Design a protein around this ligand. Structure first.
Ligand code: SF4
Ligand code: SF4
Ligand code: SF4
Ligand code: SF4
Ligand code: SF4
Ligand code: ZN
Lengths: 181, 71, 73, 109, 158, 185, 99, 125, 376, 127, 149
């Protein structure tokens, strides 16, 4: 601690070169100059405009490559866009997708069961980029909070109706992002 | 039928099978076609080439559209 | 002694006395590649899978359902 | 205004936090005035596909193993010697105490 | 049971629901990586103080517990103990995927498969992480859910 | 790169404990015996031209096929000479290996973590309580034979008014997908 | 504090005795920790601990003995820190197929 | 002149750095005289200790000895010398010298290339 | 006497309000990340690194991708390297802002929190425009990146850099030079360089003492050796000097961001070989081989050669390292995750010795312990 | 709806913001979409008045206007309505999720489902 | 030389293979996919018109997608040698040559199930297992059969 004491003495000698400097330092420490400056900046921000978003009527900016709510699309004709290739759950890191399928009546390969857990999905977009036919897409919707876990457990019919409801916005985002691909 | 009722329970709207059966076959002059899904190849499905020697319409196996040779 | 490591490994005692099958998985009949042969697996005969009443998933109650086929090579 | 007396507000080169809607983000990302074109391969590797030469994953030399015995260890020990220039170099660095406005006048970035 | 007493009871219930909706005092249970997004929700942009939400550090003064993050077997007893100290008018918002059904660590030791197994959660907020927009949507959904509480009518008709 | 102090070590280090050495661009590797690991790390830390005075970390790897399944790896760094080194040994379930808490004080928590995850006990640790898993954890999670989902799970038991631990009964069992290609070898 | 592996059966026996002493001295703390005074029977608890030690006699490796003592001391610390006629065949048969 | 600060907070400037280094190097040589001559550790220790002792004897100013040695921070040099004394004491306390006979060491060398953008500790100039 | 605090659990031995010793209990956020990574493919394991050290998201992606490329030997294009550097520096700015403002709130200063969150919201908007989500954006992949930059992003980042230079000046004016702030920070939790080396400190906590060692300069893993930035060091390692170092690191991160924006090249965004990087949607829908390779890369993974390596990067917290051991299969055999919070929280014991409770919380804030990475 | 401002205070903020705004559109549900450029910060130059002052919800924005409101697209809802697909599609429905068991979504195996389906994957003998 | 030969042969095999792996039932168990990812190149120089073949009806067990057939004649000589019934055959000449029966002849044999097993590509597949599941999902237990002795 002797080294600390002598360092303190040397520093005190260094910053006490003359009466002008010592008086200036004492006045600055006594009259709260830094506190006054902080108060002035605080007052400036009190009088400046705010950045509050006003949630329900004004909503934050997004991007077409947004990972919101998982959903299933359809072809323009009306048939399901999803063949049963099972690339969803092969790549789904959280294993939130379960799919079962069989040959349809007309020989087409379609999924007879397709459910996604929204409590297990990590909203990562691996399925929507692993889809060979752009069938599953993570839609722009994100305000789908549910009161029950069973409600949050989706299935094929709910995914298809979500895709039908959000088809136009999903199509616009898909065009804009297929440009970026 | 059984498959549609197995994955869907609404039984009030039209199932995709009925819509895809209602869309008419597409008449093409050539012997082979290129099936892409929609007007934008990048937004459809992988390209599928379909042979049309058989008289009956041929399902695309992707976005099944039943292309038929002209003559 | 044959079993001291198991009895001190922390595995529950109820799972330390169960018949297992040691076998080398044969080559798949679908394809002729021979890079997945020669490995040996412990086959914990855990077949107690049922259907979830709510969503129809494959539930289980045996901790050794997939470890022998996934991690233990 | 009292806040221009001293502090960052008194600085002429002071920038407001809020960005104007007419100058921050002119075009929405899904509607851009110009169409992108992102390359995915070199022009050389388009019609000249040849993977056994650019197979960087598998084109590696085999691992070499050598079992040195007591005789080899003694031979290397006797053969080897240490000089002032064979010692490992030291990664030395030190503080400079340089002003913040020294690099490019504080502007260039 | 009448039509004027019913109207008075409805007005009293509306006043009570308005008070409880406008004075929600949630408490953060900020584990893992929904808590950072929660702090973003509490920030200047999507401000929570406008709607009456202020975070009370003491569970005894809080209204609803917002569990954001992963629930661990080592921490679930603490979560339950803290929940038990909350007053009887109480609600739970499970934010993210970890607190809903285990999320990205569902098949993992020492991970509770959702906070629903420990405490009765009222509203789930899907996302990973849910946008601050979505979390504020969930809080507004909690306000809507507690906007249909006929406590006075239920007490009267017993 | 920077394979200077590695070669200098192999030139100056006693040859008694150098079981094997690996010269790689993925990291220079020393593999020794558990008896002489403490002495080897003391030599490296204190020598003036191999000053690996900071212990990056201690890791464990499980190899069920080998007789000594556990592999204890030590990643060390030399800031004075700017290079990373790796020193590893092999230990089994029962045998206790020497602790390097005295040399590197940071090694305490990594050694406790290794104990927690694998079961490799250390000889001179000031304490060796579990650090990461739940209180009263029975197994060692990072062992290969340890199931991914564990053996027990917790839930709230209303009659007991506490969170109890019960054997696992999880729904939606883990689906192991065998993606391995027979032509990968 | 953790000690090196015991090199002798006598040393392992001494360590076992020390661990049993520790359990016996820490038994009355468990009384106030758990509060099962009605049917605890502290003597019966000591008998059960002795019975566990006696059923762990088939082990002869000093390393295994030391590891068992280490895990037993860990369990003791955890408990101190409060962390919790139709033949056998026919009953299992009536219960389920997997037995 | 005198070094105002060594930059390192733990290290403290020493006035008699040259004398301390001379004494430490002399004691290093005296202690390493006990190590067997065949060992490479003793040869390397004698080499660098003699070189450092020679340069610190020839050059008087600590700035000059730092500049000529190229390691800098005579305080760091003193710390290294003290650690060398401790290591020599340890290798006298336990005897690692001599191959154990019937000894085999597996030298492994692979030339697997790595991309130029991975973190590799570049050699000092 | 022992005083208990209960995801940060901490037991302190006190005599006269003076902290004799502090012992943290950390396992409260253990999630089996290493076990799950062993059980999952490399691409499926990238989100785990997204989740680790969640305040600094893309730094962990960068470390994991660098380790995979080291074990895989695949060349990353210059444009991908530059955008990775740009977003790593954006990540560093985000982490430093959050650390400084949470530390200020723990001290008692409440107002800079929301200004720095406005800045962080701008940066998270950058993340959401370039990739999927604001947080945990799996954008950095082995061999390159997921997608190219949307147009206008560079201009928006330039505007942010100017306004953020103004904001850093603003925050430094409010916090630095305050008598209360100085009394809270100076001579609190001081660490010698020898102590830091012994306890394995890294990053600001190691440069605070003045070891004068940075990973981006010792082992440049990017265009860092072409960006001529500055690395600040502390004269006497304490909370005040570490805070000043963090401010200077924010300034140098802005400098690096401007340099990357200026000299970003035009080219591809990922590794050229489709055996290791997935082909584009048009290529997989048009080409037979591309469809095969997309299918195989999204069912199976790239089979890295059997090897073990340790790859470390200069994460904003400190040195974040990943130790990957493979066996030639599509899944990582072993993945050890060395986070620069595990060592610092050990350092808490000796740092907060003979201090008080407010000094303990100040030391915790200065070390910036994110419990996800310490419970990896 | 101006009397709701006194007990709402949030509709009051919206009405204050609709002083110099221009009504860029209106949807079929009654929501009136406003834009206001000029001297306005970036984050508050597009918004909506839900035309349901009592119980306005954040999920009442149709997908046609969702992107424009969230600044994803410069395309107003009219163009997306013009581009709406045919031969399939459903009308926009709010996130009720608590307004009734007959309104919320139920799984095929849930007891509350109007038709509950068994899941055993085998057909018994069924004498 | 060998690597270039393998790459060229893989390119020629894949120049007319249909881009229908996702609907192909041989996903993860297709020799064309694995050998293309192991020995073939990562790109495709072909962008012209492919060839297409109409499907054949070969019974209630073998579903045939003849666009995927690589004409390896492994099943033509299987029916000749092992099965013992000569119905399958390679008929045609050139780039477009079809395989099956000239007349509508459902293949019928006790060993007819092995025809789908030896097909490397997903040309011949089990009809009852048409699109039920992939390979990685299924766990395989090594057992014996009790239908025969
Ligand atoms: S977004 Fe990711 S986590 Fe969600 S379903 Fe798709 S692959 Fe799974
Ligand atoms: S990847 Fe696409 S086509 Fe395949 S199962 Fe998923 S949604 Fe269906
Ligand atoms: S739900 Fe996702 S964002 Fe939230 S704590 Fe879990 S991993 Fe993090
Ligand atoms: S067999 Fe051909 S069509 Fe089927 S997945 Fe393999 S490469 Fe594709
Ligand atoms: S085995 Fe398959 S690929 Fe070979 S000739 Fe027969 S149908 Fe064609
Ligand atoms: Zn089609």
């Amino acid at each position: 601690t002797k080294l600390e004491d002598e360092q303190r003495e040397q520093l005190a000698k260094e910053i006490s070169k003359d009466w002008s400097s010592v008086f200036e330092r004492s006045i600055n420490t006594l009259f709260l100059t830094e506190m006054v400056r902080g108060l002035m900046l605080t007052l400036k921000y009190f009088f400046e405009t705010k950045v509050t978003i006003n949630y329900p009527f004004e909503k934050g900016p997004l991007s077409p490559r947004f990972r919101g709510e998982h959903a299933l699309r359809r072809y323009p004709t009306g048939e399901e866009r999803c063949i049963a290739c099972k690339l969803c759950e092969a790549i789904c890191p959280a294993q939130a997708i379960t799919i079962e399928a069989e040959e349809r009546e007309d020989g087409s390969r379609r999924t007879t069961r397709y459910d996604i857990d929204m409590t297990k999905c990590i909203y990562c977009g691996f399925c929507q980029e692993a889809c060979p036919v752009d069938a599953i897409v993570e839609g722009p919707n994100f305000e789908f909070a549910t009161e029950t876990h069973e409600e949050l457990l989706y299935d094929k019919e709910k995914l298809l109706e979500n895709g039908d409801r959000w088809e136009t916005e999903i199509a616009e985002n898909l065009r804009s992002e297929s440009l970026y691909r | 039928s059984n498959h549609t009722a197995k994955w869907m329970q609404d039984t009030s709207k039209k199932s995709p099978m009925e819509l895809i059966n209602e869309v008419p076959p597409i008449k093409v002059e050539g012997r082979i076609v290129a099936c892409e899904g929609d007007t934008n190849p990048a937004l459809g499905h992988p390209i599928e080439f379909i042979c049309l020697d058989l008289p009956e319409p041929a399902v695309c196996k992707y976005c099944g559209l039943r292309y038929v040779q002209d003559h | 002694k044959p079993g001291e490591i198991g009895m001190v490994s922390g595995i529950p005692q109820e799972h330390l006395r169960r018949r297992v099958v040691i076998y080398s998985p044969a080559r798949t009949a679908s394809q002729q590649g021979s890079g997945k042969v020669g490995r040996w697996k412990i086959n914990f005969l855990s077949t107690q899978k049922w259907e979830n009443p709510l969503m129809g998933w494959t539930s289980t109650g045996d901790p050794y359902a997939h470890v022998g086929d996934s991690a233990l090579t | 205004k009292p806040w221009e007396i001293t502090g960052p507000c008194a600085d002429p080169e002071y920038r407001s936090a809020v960005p104007l809607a007419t100058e921050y983000r002119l075009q929405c990302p899904a509607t851009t005035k110009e169409k992108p074109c992102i390359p995915n391969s070199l022009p050389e590797t388009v019609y000249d596909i040849k993977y056994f030469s650019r197979d960087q994953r598998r084109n590696r030399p085999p691992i070499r193993r050598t079992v040195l015995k007591k005789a080899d260890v003694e031979k290397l020990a006797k053969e080897q010697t240490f000089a002032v220039s064979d010692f490992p170099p030291v990664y030395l660095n030190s503080a400079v105490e340089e002003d913040i406005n020294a690099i490019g006048g504080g502007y260039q970035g | 049971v009448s039509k004027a007493a019913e109207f008075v009871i409805s007005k009293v219930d509306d006043l009570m629901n308005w008070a409880r909706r406008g004075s929600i005092w949630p408490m953060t249970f900020g584990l893992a990586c929904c808590a950072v997004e929660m702090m973003h929700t509490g920030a200047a942009r999507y401000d929570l103080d406008r709607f009456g939400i202020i975070f009370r550090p003491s569970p005894r003064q809080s209204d609803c517990m917002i569990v954001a993050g992963t629930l661990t077997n080592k921490m679930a007893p603490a979560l339950r103990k803290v929940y038990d100290q909350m007053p009887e008018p109480r609600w739970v918002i499970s934010m993210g995927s970890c607190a809903n059904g285990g999320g990205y660590y569902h098949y993992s030791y020492s991970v509770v498969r959702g906070c629903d197994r420990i405490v009765p959660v009222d509203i789930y907020v899907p996302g990973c992480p849910p946008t601050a927009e979505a979390l504020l949507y969930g809080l507004l959904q909690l306000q809507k859910k507690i906007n249909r509480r006929k406590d006075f009518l239920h007490w009267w008709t017993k | 790169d920077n394979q200077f102090i590695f070669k200098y070590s192999w030139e100056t280090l006693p040859k008694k404990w150098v079981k094997k050495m690996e010269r790689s661009e993925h990291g220079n590797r020393f593999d020794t015996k558990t008896d002489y690991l403490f002495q080897l790390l003391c030599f490296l830390k204190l020598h003036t031209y191999t000053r690996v005075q900071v212990l990056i970390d201690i890791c464990g790897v499980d190899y069920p096929s080998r007789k000594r399944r556990f592999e204890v790896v030590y990643n060390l760094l030399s800031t004075r000479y700017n290079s990373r080194i790796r020193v590893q040994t092999s230990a089994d379930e029962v045998t206790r290996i020497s602790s390097v808490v005295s040399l590197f004080p940071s090694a305490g928590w990594w050694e406790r973590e290794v104990w927690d995850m694998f079961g490799v006990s250390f000889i001179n640790h000031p304490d060796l309580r579990r650090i990461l898993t739940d209180y009263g954890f029975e197994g060692h999670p990072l062992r290969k034979d340890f199931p991914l989902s564990g053996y027990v799970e917790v839930r709230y038991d209303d009659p007991e008014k506490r969170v109890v631990s019960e054997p696992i009964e999880m729904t939606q069992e883990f689906r192991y997908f065998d993606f391995a290609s027979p032509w990968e070898q | 504090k953790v000690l090196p592996n015991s090199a002798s059966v006598e040393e392992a026996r001494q360590r076992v005795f020390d661990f049993f002493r520790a359990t016996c001295r820490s038994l009355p703390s468990v009384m106030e920790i758990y509060n099962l005074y009605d049917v605890t029977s502290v003597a019966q608890l000591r008998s059960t601990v002795a019975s566990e030690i006696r059923k762990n006699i088939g082990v002869s490796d000093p390393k295994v003995i030391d590891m068992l003592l280490f895990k037993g001391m860990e369990e003791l610390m955890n408990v101190v820190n409060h962390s919790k006629a139709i033949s056998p065949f026919l009953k299992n048969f009536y219960s389920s197929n997997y037995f | 002149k005198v070094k105002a600060s060594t930059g390192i907070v733990g290290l403290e400037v020493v006035p008699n750095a040259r004398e301390v280094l001379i004494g430490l190097y002399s004691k290093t040589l005296k202690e390493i005289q006990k190590v067997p001559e065949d060992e490479g550790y003793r040869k390397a220790v004698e080499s660098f200790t003699k070189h450092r002792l020679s340069v610190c004897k020839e050059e008087e100013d600590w700035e000059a000895i730092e500049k000529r040695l190229g390691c800098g921070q005579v305080e760091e040099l003193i710390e290294e010398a003290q650690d060398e004394l401790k290591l020599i004491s340890y290798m006298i306390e336990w005897d690692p010298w001599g191959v154990p006979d019937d000894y085999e060491c597996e030298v492994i060398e692979n030339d697997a290339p790595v991309p130029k953008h991975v973190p590799l500790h570049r050699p000092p100039p | 006497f022992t005083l208990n605090f209960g995801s940060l659990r901490l037991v302190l031995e006190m005599n006269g309000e003076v902290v004799e010793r502090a012992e943290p209990h950390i396992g409260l956020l253990h999630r089996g990340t290493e076990k799950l990574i062993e059980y999952k493919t490399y691409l499926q394991a990238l989100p785990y690194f997204d989740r680790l050290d969640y305040v600094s998201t893309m730094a962990q992606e960068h470390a994991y991708s660098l380790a995979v490329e080291r074990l895989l030997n695949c060349e990353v294009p210059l444009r991908a390297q530059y955008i990775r550097v740009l977003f790593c520096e954006i990540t560093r700015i985000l982490n430093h802002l959050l650390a400084l403002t949470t530390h200020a709130m723990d001290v008692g200063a409440s107002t800079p929190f929301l200004w720095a969150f406005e800045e962080r919201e701008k940066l998270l908007e950058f993340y959401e425009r370039v990739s999927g989500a604001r947080m945990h954006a799996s954008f950095i992949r082995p061999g390159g990146v997921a997608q190219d930059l949307p147009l206008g992003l560079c201009r928006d980042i330039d505007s942010f850099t100017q306004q953020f230079a103004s904001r850093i000046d603003e925050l430094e004016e409010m916090l630095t030079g305050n008598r209360i702030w100085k009394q809270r920070l100076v001579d609190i939790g001081t660490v010698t360089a020898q102590q830091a080396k012994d306890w394995g400190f890294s990053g600001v906590m190691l440069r605070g003492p003045g070891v004068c060692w940075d990973l981006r300069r010792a082992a440049p893993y990017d265009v860092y050796d072409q960006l001529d930035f500055d690395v600040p060091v502390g004269t006497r390692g304490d909370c005040y000097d570490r805070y000043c170092i963090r401010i200077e690191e924010m300034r140098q991160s802005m400098r690096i961001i401007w340099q990357c924006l200026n000299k970003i090249p035009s080219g591809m965004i990922k590794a050229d070989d489709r055996k290791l990087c997935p082909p584009s949607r048009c290529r997989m829908k048009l080409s037979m081989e591309s469809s095969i390779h997309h299918f195989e890369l999204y069912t199976e993974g790239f089979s890295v050669p059997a090897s073990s390596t340790y790859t470390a990067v200069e994460a904003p917290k400190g040195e974040f390292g990943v130790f990957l051991v493979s066996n030639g299969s599509n899944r990582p055999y072993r993945c050890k995750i060395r986070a620069p919070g595990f060592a610092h929280l050990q350092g808490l014991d000796f740092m907060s010795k003979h201090h008080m409770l407010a000094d303990v919380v100040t030391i915790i804030g200065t070390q910036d312990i994110v419990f996800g990475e310490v419970d990896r | 709806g101006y009397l709701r401002c006194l007990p709402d205070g949030n509709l009051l903020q919206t009405k204050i913001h609709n002083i110099g705004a221009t009504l860029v559109g209106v949807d079929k549900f009654g929501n009136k979409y406003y834009e206001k450029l000029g001297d306005t910060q970036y984050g508050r130059h597009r918004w909506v008045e839900y035309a349901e002052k009592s119980r306005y919800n954040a999920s009442q924005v149709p997908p046609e206007w969702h992107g424009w409101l969230h600044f994803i697209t410069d395309h107003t809802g009219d163009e997306l309505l013009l581009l709406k697909p045919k031969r399939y599609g459903v009308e926009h429905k709010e996130n009720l999720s608590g307004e009734g068991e007959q309104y919320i979504y139920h799984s095929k195996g849930h007891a509350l489902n109007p038709g509950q389906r068994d899941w055993t994957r085998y057909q018994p003998w069924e004498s | 030389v060998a690597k270039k030969a393998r790459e060229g042969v893989m390119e020629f095999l894949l120049m007319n293979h249909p881009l229908d792996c996702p609907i192909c039932d041989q996903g993860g168990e297709c020799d064309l996919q694995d050998q293309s990812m192991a020995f073939g190149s990562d790109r495709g120089r072909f962008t012209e018109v492919k060839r297409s073949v109409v499907d054949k009806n070969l019974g209630p067990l073998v579903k045939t997608v003849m666009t995927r057939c690589i004409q390896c004649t492994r099943c033509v000589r299987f029916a000749t040698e092992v099965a013992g019934v000569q119905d399958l055959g390679m008929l045609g000449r050139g780039s477009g040559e079809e395989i099956g029966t000239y007349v509508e002849k459902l293949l019928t044999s006790e060993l007819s199930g092995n025809v789908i097993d030896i097909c490397p590509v997903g040309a011949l597949t089990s009809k009852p297992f048409a699109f039920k599941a992939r390979n990685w999902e299924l766990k395989g237990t090594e057992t014996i059969d009790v239908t025969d002795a």
